[PDB]
Amino acid sequence: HHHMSIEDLARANVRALTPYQSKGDVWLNANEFPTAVAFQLTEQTLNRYPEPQPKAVIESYARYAEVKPEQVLVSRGADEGIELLIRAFCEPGEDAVLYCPPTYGMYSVSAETIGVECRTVPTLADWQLDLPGIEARLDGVKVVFVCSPNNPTGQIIDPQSMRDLLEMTRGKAIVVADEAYIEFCPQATLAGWLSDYPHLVVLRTLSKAFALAGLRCGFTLANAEVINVLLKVIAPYPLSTPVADIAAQALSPEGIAAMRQRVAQILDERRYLVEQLRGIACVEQVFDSETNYVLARITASSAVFKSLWDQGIILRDQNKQPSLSGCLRITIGTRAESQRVIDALTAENV
Amino acid sequence: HMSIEDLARANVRALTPYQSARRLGGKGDVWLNANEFPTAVAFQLTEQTLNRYPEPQPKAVIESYARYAEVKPEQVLVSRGADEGIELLIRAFCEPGEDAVLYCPPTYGMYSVSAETIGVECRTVPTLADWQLDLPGIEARLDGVKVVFVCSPNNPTGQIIDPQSMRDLLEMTRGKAIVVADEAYIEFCPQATLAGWLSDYPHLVVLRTLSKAFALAGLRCGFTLANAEVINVLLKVIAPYPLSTPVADIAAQALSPEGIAAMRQRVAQILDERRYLVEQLRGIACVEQVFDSETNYVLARITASSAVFKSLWDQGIILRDQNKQPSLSGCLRITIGTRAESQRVIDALTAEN
Ligand SMILES: Cc1ncc(COP(=O)(O)O)c(C=O)c1O
Ligand SMILES: Cc1ncc(COP(=O)(O)O)c(C=O)c1O
Ligand SMILES: [Cl-]
């Protein structure tokens, strides 16, 4: 047989893909909670392997989410949850994933990296689901991802449309509700629907309202039968002991109350930032959000984005996303950080 | 109308969730079954930035590990253990259903587990009677192989793979496959590392871990050393944020010059304890043979090993059974622990009389 270079020994999809890629003082670009919550290690056992699925973390998250412990898996962020679902259910080259742009980019990245076709069905003008469009495109789909509330547009997906989607996929595909932002609108969660839908899965994270993006700790909620499949494909030791230690501390009753106050702070600050933005000459529209970010369409958005960037105010450009021409996504930070944004947009004179 | 398990990939249905038989601490079990350093080294966090995403590849960890390993920073990737290094290599280079991995039993099980989970053929080439490589056997089985894993020193048998045989294997695979030297245990015999060979073999990769001599299994922190071309392929398939900030913080602490010196002292402790345990083991009626090792474990063939394993297990002394491994019938793998743990093992084996 003939020899190949390192780059040609790599899988064809790996050679072709573009991987996800990531200076100033105001960072409002990644939906992080704006201030650190300090935690110290309480378990000096680092010479020993951790538990594969740390019981205190699983049980505390299950109590918080009001599900059974056997309905909970813990992983390296909701990002790993996405990977596990495609790894378990999608035969590379034969099965597809489906998602609905404009939305979170890692469904596509994980699928393309694993070797699984992406089906895309743009949402409607209000970013609600195109159920007929999904129906037409479901052949060969094994996993459907729906972000609700959606990143980057901010709105909750209509609950009955999710039931309609779940009936459309019953016996055919897993439906994944990505609830990375559900702490900001907790009454909207679908985690209470597991008994109706054997194929429903919910992703959760500590990265956002819980203010622990640095831990890389996320959860998959599903019926036990789905959890048991995902535990067949997960790494033996996916959570380090320091992360398990801090996660358990964060998920105590005291930790939960603290998170709920973090959410209240963000909701109050979002109300302030939205009202201020709507008065700024370069802001064309601010879209209502149920999260810790708001999408704003801005006149000359690329010049404004670069202008704030050069001033050290780092937003998230969404101008290339389907339907989002002119839109920047602004995370809700501190009042001082909101005021930096307000003052810089006001100074843009466009 | 398919049930949940029927929607899963066919290969996934036959997998088994990872089974840890390990009870809580506080039952007093003696854990000599996972090649862990036997006592904790304490670290505290120094960086309270947990609201922010970590660095994708923490610079201080990468550059510290590169200094330690005497390679360039562009030749280093950090992952969730060497386990994730194994996964990335198969994920980058093995097309499921088309390409194969190759390894040489009896050896570490996760090469097979990762390949079977991803859906990549496992090609096996059992080693020779002394557990050295069967190079003719490998050459006959290399068609379609994209990644070869060789554990040196080997787990569970403990010996270093002959360096000339690794050069021969590298020439055999040039242009055809990646060769991965799994160096999880290389700190116990650091002169045997192949990390200095990168400039001679574009397709050589070395896996390292903090889980063993570095006494930081709980961190889930490992490293892949390779030429930059290989690192850059692997970085296309790694998760965007694979290392948490607490792990990066502690890892950088552990890889300081003082941390390296402390690790060397841990190795010296294990080497001295291994000499004691081996000498005592060879004097015990039920021990048939103890195989020389260059690691923090020894493989011992034991008369009625299954009954002895169960006897010690029921006493709370936890070894690693290897009786079902090719060529290893009768063999238990015994991690080197503290002196008092060695003495628990010695005393229990002596009482099997
Ligand atoms: C919609 C959504 N899901 C998941 C994630 C990833 O979450 P994690 O930090 O738990 O990996 C993000 C990160 O920004 C996100 O926006
Ligand atoms: C040969 C070998 N390689 C790799 C590993 C996994 O190491 P890590 O803890 O870095 O994932 C082990 C663990 O025992 C091992 O024995
Ligand atoms: Cl189309």
> Residues B277-281: contacts with CB within 8 Å, 24+ apart?
B277/B334, B277/B336, B277/B342, B277/B345, B277/B346, B280/B342, B280/B346, B281/B334, B281/B346, B281/B349
Residues B152 and B288 in one domain: no
Give the separation between CA A54 and CA A62, rounded to whole angstroms: 12
Phi-psi sector, B28: left (phi>0), alpha (psi -120 to 50), beta: left
Residue A296 lies in a domain: yes
Bridge-based pairing state of the strands B287-290 and B297-302: antiparallel
Q: Nearest ligand to the C-alpha of residue B36?
A: 2
Residues A241 and A118 in one domain: yes
Strands across the sheet containing A96-99: A72-75, A218-222, A200-205, A174-178, A141-147, A96-99, A117-120
Q: Which domain holds residue A175?
A: 48-252
**Nearest-CA residue of chain B relative to A250?**
B50
Identify which of A280, A297, A257 has the alpha carbon closest to the alpha carbon of residue A338. Answer: A280
Residues B71 and B110 in one domain: yes
Alpha-carbon separation of residue A205 from A75, A213, A217 (angstroms): 9, 8, 6
CB A311 within 8 A of CB A344: yes
Residues A114 and A133 in one domain: yes
Residues B343 and B200 in one domain: no
Give the separation between CA A258 and CA A168, rounded to whole angstroms: 39
Q: Looking at the CA of residue A80, tell me the nearest atom of ligand 1.
A: 11
Give the separation between CA A139 and CA A155, rounded to whole angstroms: 28
The neighbouring-strand residues paired with B151 are B182
Interface of A with B in 246-305 (CB under 8 A): 246
Residue B97 lies in a domain: yes
Q: Give how far the C-alpha of residue A6 lies from the chain's centroid of Cα atoms, to the nearest Å.
A: 34
Stated as kind and residue range, the H or E segment containing A77 is helix A77-89
Torsion of CA B319, B322, B324, B325, to 10 degrees: 160
Q: How was this structure determined?
A: X-ray
Stated as kind and residue range, the H or E segment containing B206 is strand B204-209
In a 13 Å sphere around the CA of B2, the CA atoms on its Cβ side amount to 12
Residue B353 lies in a domain: no
Q: Which chain A residues contact residue B36 at CB under 8 A?
A: 47-49
Residue B47 lies in a domain: no
Q: Count Cβ neighbours within 10 Å for each residue of A246-285 and write b for 16 or more, e otherwise.
A: bbbbbbeeebeeebeebbebbeebbeebbebbeebebbee
Residues B8 and B116 in one domain: no
Residues B7 and B138 in one domain: no
Interface of A with B in 137-176 (CB under 8 A): 142, 170-174
Q: Nearest ligand to the C-alpha of residue A118?
A: 3
In chain B, the number of structural domains is 2
Using CB atoms, pick whichever of A76, A233, A234 lies closest to residue B239.
Answer: A76
Alpha carbon of A87 to ligand 2 centroid (Å): 22
In a 13 Å sphere around the CA of A158, the CA atoms on its Cβ side amount to 12
Domain end (from A226, A252, A278): A252
Tokens of A82: 């996405």
φ, ψ at A333 (rounded to 5°): -110, -145
Residues A77 and A90 in one domain: yes
Residues B125 and B169 in one domain: yes
Using CB atoms, pick whichever of A6, A36, A115 lies closest to residue B203.
Answer: A6
Bridge-based pairing state of the strands B222-226 and B100-103: unpaired
Ligand 2 neighbour B222 (Cβ under 6 A) = yes
- Please tell me the distance in Å from B140's CA to the nearest CA on chain A: 13
CB A181 within 8 A of CB A331: no
Q: Give how far the C-alpha of residue B108 lies from the chain's centroid of Cα atoms, to the nearest Å.
A: 7
Ligand 2 neighbour B108 (Cβ under 6 A) = yes
Alpha-carbon separation of residue A202 from A216, A228, B170 (angstroms): 17, 15, 46
Q: Give how far the C-alpha of residue B148 lies from the chain's centroid of Cα atoms, to the nearest Å.
A: 15
Of B22, B110, B210, B299, best ligand 2 pocket probe by most atoms within 8 Å of the beta carbon: B110
Residues B197 and B111 in one domain: yes
Tokens of A91: 């035969």
Amino acid at B229: E
Count of positions (residues) in chain B: 353
Give the separation between CA B80 and CA B239, rounded to whole angstroms: 10
Residues B138 and B76 in one domain: yes
Stated as kind and residue range, the H or E segment containing A80 is helix A77-89
- Please tell me the distance in Å from A331's CA to the nearest CA on chain B: 13
3-state secondary structure of B347: helix
Residue A43 lies in a domain: no
Give the separation between CA A243 and CA A251, rounded to whole angstroms: 12
Alpha-carbon separation of residue B292 from B70, B88, B157, B162, B299 (angstroms): 28, 32, 8, 15, 8
CB contact under 8 A, B178 and A1: no
Residues B203 and B124 in one domain: yes
Stated as kind and residue range, the H or E segment containing A245 is helix A241-250
Residue A42 lies in a domain: no
Domain end (from A227, A252, A277): A252
Tokens of A76: 């390296």
Peptide bond preceding B202: is omega within 30 degrees of 0, i.e. cis? no
Interface probe for B, chosen from A28, A37, A232 (most Cβ of B below 10 Å), is A232
Domain end (from A252, A285, A313): A252
Q: Looking at the CA of residue B35, tell me the nearest atom of ligand 2.
A: 14
DSSP secondary structure, A191-210, as one string: GGGGGG-TTEEEEEESSSTT
- Please tell me the distance in Å from A334's CA to the nearest CA on chain B: 13
**Nearest-CA residue of chain B relative to A262?**
B51
Residue B194 lies in a domain: yes
Residue B46 lies in a domain: no
In 3-state terms, chain A is what percent helix, strand and coil (to 5)? 40, 15, 45
Angle, helices B81-93 vs B228-237, to 10°: value is 90
Strands across the sheet containing B297-302: B287-290, B297-302, B331-335, B320-321
Interface residue B82 vs chain A (CB under 8 A): no
Give the separation between CA B26 and CA B133, rounded to whole angstroms: 43
Give alpha helix (H) positions in chain B: 4-7, 10-13, 59-69, 81-93, 110-118, 135-139, 163-173, 228-237, 245-254, 257-281, 305-314, 339-351
Interface probe for B, chosen from A6, A53, A143 (most Cβ of B below 10 Å), is A6
Identify which of B127, B61, B182 has the alpha carbon closest to the alpha carbon of residue B326. Answer: B127
CB B208 within 8 A of CB B188: no
